[model samples]
Target: THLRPYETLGAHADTMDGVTGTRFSVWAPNARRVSVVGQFNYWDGRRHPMRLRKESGIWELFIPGAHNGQLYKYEMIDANGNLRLKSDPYAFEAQMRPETASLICGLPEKVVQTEERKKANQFDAPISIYEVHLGSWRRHTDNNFWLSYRELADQLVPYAKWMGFTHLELLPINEHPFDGSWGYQPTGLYAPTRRFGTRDDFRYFIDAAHAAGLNVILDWVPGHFPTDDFALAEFDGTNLYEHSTLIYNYGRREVSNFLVGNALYWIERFGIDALRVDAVASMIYRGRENLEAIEFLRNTNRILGEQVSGAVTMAEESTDFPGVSRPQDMGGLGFWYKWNLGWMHDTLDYMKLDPVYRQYHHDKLTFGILYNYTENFVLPLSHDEVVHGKKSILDRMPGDAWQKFANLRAYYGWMWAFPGKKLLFMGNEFAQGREWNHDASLDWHLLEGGDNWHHGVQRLVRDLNLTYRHHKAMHELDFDPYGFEWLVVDDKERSVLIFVRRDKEGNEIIVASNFTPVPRHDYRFGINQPGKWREILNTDSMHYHGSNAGNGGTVHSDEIASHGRQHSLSLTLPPLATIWLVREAE
Candidate 1:
């Protein structure tokens, strides 16, 4: 009744059985003729022409013995001219090296192994990812030299492990031409960047990471492809794969199908833990109409969920696209996580501006509850918004050097308190001063100075990470609305914000931050009463980057009065500082 539900015409070559030769097919409806040119025929268009099948709109090619390590592209002819081009829906492999047509056979074994490890913790675990741009993170000292997988793995493993990061979210490792796009202009979905190393070498790096107990989440860009002449732009002088019009035109069915199939190819073949779909806002809304983009994303996730058990997908959306992370069956995009750009933008604005402005922007503090159902979010200081015109985090503070240090401390404390998985760019853990220039190494020399604020900031970040990992209330499950309570907010002058989180068994932690230069003695903000409270962490401690203005280690109080309630603890609010107090179970 439904034509026996034929497999999609433009499906990837690898979508067929791995061991046997594939029935390669494409729906170049407009083209008068088509040919499959690939490694089998040394990529010569005429030698390996794909035959037109019974379906006039579709072309088919059957290689009696297609095996691994094959390179392929397509050639087609319309009224215009003969156009030889790379496969838009290539699934086997596309090399960034030599050219885009390089096809890799047999998916990397290391990637398959990593896929197995991912099954152990599906969408439940907290993902503290270290977002990296592999190209610039490290390079060879000599020109034309590149770091091998072993070299990169050896260096990055300890750094990630020491930083308490669970996942390493890499920028697109797929083959691309423009280095400036930072791998967003993907030409090869199946191949790792040849600029980095060979396929096996990349796998070795992933294996090393897995050995060190870290997961690798590849940043996948299926939203769009660069219109490079060597790529799939106008394959065979006809809009063979992509739309004739810009992606905005929904009437272009061929183009739309191409992108949807491309999305599936990456997840199905590469064994990527998550596909961080870049520029999702652009994909969903082109001049304000939500086309079938959302539907396409949902189908992508559905396919991934069916194929890979623990596969996770995330959207890099900047808009208020409600239900972007909702499940697919419910008519949502079905992403496991979405980047919390609102949190980063609002929090940075609040911290770098005056205290009075924070009062007016109080909605920022309370906005988390509105999006409570989306369990996993990444609070990222990603490489995207940090370079070129944008100043570094340390340079964006409101006051003098000491005040700046204190503000930075306060920012880190707030970030730690925020309810989500965290991601810090390479040099962010230390208070890196200069703008992130991708060409240069991080200023490790700053750590050499014993009295440097950079060193202190580094230590403080480690402490924050330690505290986060040790606290049950700050765990991934704490995303549930029942897990947290905003106990206090002082809107008046000398503004302060405080909140508490609780574990399932009712273990409580009270976190507070003050945004004033003058110390407030026995600052009365009503949160809890009549029980002894112990201070566990203070951002203003001498060991931290802030001015040494708060008591060190832990402090206990028997009884203190606040707002007609006899509170057991009187908090000595430090200038631009954050403190955490925990009440132990009796």
Candidate 2:
């Protein structure tokens, strides 16, 4: 149904007779006359009129003495004799906003060292994503401009490595007409944001990230497109690229290819390790019983998996879909992972309540574990939580400033210990005081305020990253319930919880957390292997700006036969704290 990528679409500049002539092709099935009108012809459609091919619905023109850096648009007479100038749908670059002009650019390539990227995105690989918005994460202090992707490479990569994040998840950077949509409503799917830099400059950013040993992920949106007149609203005087209800109608076969090909273009042509699809919950929920919706998603993810080796597709799906991350052939959409929106909501709702009443709502904290293994899950504390009247994570705690900091430290520790891969928004690692503002940068001044709250929280996040990576038991079998067993499942009276994590090797680690401010002294725990356990991490340590009430960094189990185990330990449990215990080597 289509011709050569360049031969039948957009504007391709090919050299003919020592002169490069740009060939312009567009699909207008019912157009009587098609014309190429640009700066080269001073918008004269008659001077450069094109001819219709006898074979199909395409209109073509190859204008000699035409060159790059000249902006252009298609002038066509629609089926009903309506006239309109439209931008190229497959354009590789677009002019800045309010301009609405397409650029004469060719495709970019990533044909080297692809196996390395595939290996990093494997399901077994530990993925700790540092979700970011390039326009907001950091900016030039001089004039508050967005850092070019090249500049971000030098700064962003090292910080992610130091923070122990395995991958970087950027907000959509595709060409958009507004900075407000944050690149989600993109027009030029093939082009990176000109707001950031040229497409090649963005290419260098990915190369830079890979060179520094971190995988790159993009937030891709294919559910709906903008209804702009210049773009693909009515390319052929029809709903050619989409349809109704703020969602693209993928029922159209050509539109389906457009959406599916978008993912492959990024992963195969650009070296993206993963595409975390946006608004999948809408696609699945809009027609929960519709077979077509299921097929659309199934085909999309199926093609993504088969075409791109070591590349993963993830859905931001909130509903309890039957088989989101399961193979399509097995009666499921073939995404490799799905965000655990239920866990995020429940855990945060539990944390926001006063500790005095936490016991009444304790199920909110434990309910997620009931179905943790249903899908390949990732526990995400994402950008959606902190914006649009929702308070920053720190501001949501019900306590004084000091208690709020402790509450945050404790919650983060527990999140790391729970089963699943991890993701935290950009500023939450250090507990930013303000909600994220796309127009403004994070509160970097908080780190230099000497309050020690932000600094301590930052240190705790670093240690959690280190500790999470150090133990295979922590993340090795995240999707399998076999690796996790609770040591104390019924302790709501004390706002206390204990769990044991193990790998296939049977190596052991214990995770304990206390929600109240009342320290539990001489706490006993059941242990299978009676030996010394090292205090691997403590959220309440004096170094993390809390009362340093802990077990001297080490404790030994006794044959006291406590809590249904042959061995037990009497340890100190600090208030509003989480601690990780690992069996020491002999």
Candidate 3:
């Protein structure tokens, strides 16, 4: 058969029949000649030229006795005498170890089946994710210095389970050359990063996580690819999988069917439950072309829901793209959850500045409502803001050491009180003094030395998690318009901000923060009714990572106040303290 240009390639494997053998096909329809290359042919390209079959433009040459773990690529020659080597878009194994040509079998169906049963609802639980860059997360103490997939899995599983994280949001783990891009510059979508281990190694990691009751969320990079020679940049010296024009201005497609297929491959093949797509804002906004990338994600989700039984897709968009997490049928992106970037930005801005700005920016207190109603959101203290030249969260405080600790206490208290899912990067829980350096250890010694304030901070975080888990109003289903109400902002002398979080059933609780430097004598809160209200949680408690000099879990009697028409409680407001008081149920 004489192949022609723009002709469809047929004669592929019969839609993945259960019968197993080496099923081979190639897409070089216009090639004057083509051949299979790699370990199967002793790395020789020319001798094993495949024959073009009649009625199908595909070139096929199957090895009848071949089993799994076979490695191969296509070597093609066009009529113009140009020779090119191409990796199979559907290659089961593109092993980077023992050279990149080493091929392996696709993951077994049994492995994928096991993973499907472990998947969880992305919106139903408190998804406290521990975002990690595998390469930098840890180094083995052995002479190898490299932390293999199995080793890292062993180390992280217990920590994640103990830390109360629902999922491990890993930085991109796809095969790439530039480690500095942090696995963002993905070249091989189907292949796991060779630096880690084999495809089975990655499976072992996921399997171990599932065994430990934790889900693995891949930080997928479908936005861009590195312009390296070995990558998809110029496969067969043509824009075969990418756009012909510079779609991203940086010369990349915002959405590629091949990339989407790769996304599907991970869920189908590896049993990965969720995908946190990196740089989605860049993908959506670049090239002035608003494609249905979000719709594509929604379709993928729908398909995975039917096929894999449990799957989720989340977009890491930094911009205020309305309906980011809304359903696709509602003319919105159908994502299970969207990163609440606005909350992070606005809150950080408020914490870094004075109370004057915070009062003027009262909208920050209630910003959760705007995004929460749209879709489930994850309020993350992500790695993007706190490393390199950026200051640590502790360093961003407004006063001296004591006041700084107080400010930190106030900030954390507010975060816990907010009605959204939460995530904290490794060192933030303990209030590590310096910005994170991925190369070194997580300053574990900080826990040992009395100088490190993280022990107290971690205690506060644990207590906050405990409170969050116990409170019905803070649960996922409780996110309604009536869930949160701003009680008062006492900007008079000692700055204080207070709010009430409640369900529609009248179950209300008040959260107060004192940003002042001194105790307020008979400081009356204007939100409570004339009744006994008990202190539910306090960041200023000695048990927390604070000075431990505030009111020791006091329950006060509410009285008629001059500030408002409600009952009030006269309590000593310690400088830089955070308090949560719940009105006793009748």
Candidate 4:
């Protein structure tokens, strides 16, 4: 940690004495000798032995002819006189899988961050995130090849924006060797994975997203690294970087510097809106408390907030470790948002049950609200749920064909209206039938046919995003307890629940849910204001391949008191559907 504030590390194109090549710098404190070896020197350690700065134990060397696009590695003579060939931990780019050479790409260009982008990432913003795995989101029909970064910008960026997501949450785009790991077990922490394209191409993709009025949230994995020999696993013939197998030795100053620097590299260098730190619970508790890792999380988050204008950090933490989204100084984990895995699990479990049995588990639907404001929650239907024999979300629905689609549509309607930010995995929007396969593309063909089931579900999600964004009541006061009020929490027998979401200004959106297949007529829900309430959205709308049964466009509230309110609206609740209503200005 003695390294000067944000002091540069890694390979940089340096010009000293009119020689322009690359200046190589690496931290291998225990290495007896280190040398820069690559195609330039025929991989010979004798050609360019590096100088060890005793003060920092950093090996430094400059090669006059080593320029961009050359693949290289560091040849080290460790403390035990053992030879170790390792990739640069700070490499800005790396070769694709099966070719683990670190590429000498010039430093990543700093992307311009505007206040507009900053505001979009704030807690008050309508942050509907579309979680996508770039490798499998879509593939070339002709060759089945993954889209390059620029190619994804041309397709994925516009499509996500068009679908009304404020951000595209990409799975770790860092360089990793195993495709099955899904970029989680990354080796090149500083390099954008060459699986998509080069460093510049990644910048282009991010630029495209910003241009299209969308933010990007990177799924960053700093919890643990892969045990790749050429990477950070065992540099200097010691467990200097690897604390336990592949876990980072966060207590060490130099190791901490490497990770914290990489975090800043993504936000400051690439203009990422947020870093959703993966498996945060793993870092927080390895048996007892991983005190070093905890400090690392807080430090990284604090630094990102200070250095980057609008950049934020989120946590994919499952446990109820208090104050995850609180500021660092506030005795918390210093994240802006934490995925509500509790809510996701409870709701999905409820959805998987038959409607008849759902009445008994009514608390499952209502329990999340008890701790809704615990952390800035993101109601995440992430890729995690749709994989590993858990079954696709659509397939998890408990019913025959139509009921399955209907149940999914209803659950989504409820999710969109819930008191939190929204995050839905890519294929879940259209009801992909199979569990996600990292090796192949999503079952997009399900969305193509004349059967409007999949198409309708997709339509519902698009409209949900539009509705969620347009109404301030749905997002602005999300973190405040006053933002949400339960209107019909005790209705278990009929499997019904109703709630009202309101902004600080008292602008309200009423949401009603009917989980069972039995439609209820003359269902009166109390209203605070006696006025004509417009039916804003209905999951059972025929357009979404539902039964198309709902109250006409609007209903006028009556003076008759109901549900402890002064007025009430008697309306038909569609079977297996959720509906949203807003009082029209009189």
Best-fitting candidate, measured by lDDT?
4
Q: Model 3, 242-330: lDDT tens per residue?
A: 55623322222322435555666677667677888767776666545456555455565565566566677777777777777777777
424: Cα error in model 3, Å: 1.9
Each model's C-alpha lDDT? Answer: 0.68, 0.82, 0.67, 0.87
Comparing 1 with 2 on TM-score, the higher-scoring candidate is: 2
| Global lDDT of model 2 | 0.82
Candidate 3: residue pairs that collide: 69-105, 71-103, 430-454, 456-545
| Greater-lDDT candidate between 2 and 4 | 4
Tell me the tens digit of each residue's lDDT in model 4 across 451-528. Answer: 678899999999999999999999999889988998888999999999999998998899999999999999987877
Cα error, candidate 2, residue 390 (Å): 0.8
Tens digit per residue, CA lDDT, model 2, 358-429: 888879888888888778888998999999989899999879999999999999999998988898999999
The true-versus-predicted C-alpha distance at residue 494 of model 4, in Å, is 0.8
State in Å the error of residue 90, model 2: 0.9
| Predicted candidate 1 versus true structure: per-residue lDDT over 291-335, tens digit per residue | 667766776677677666576788788777777888776756788
What TM-score does structure 4 among the candidates reach? 0.97
| 197: Cα error in model 1, Å | 0.9
Ranking by TM-score: 4, 2, 3, 1
User: What are the clashing pairs of model 4?
Assistant: none
TM-scores for candidates 1 onward, in order: 0.84, 0.95, 0.85, 0.97
Best by TM-score: 4
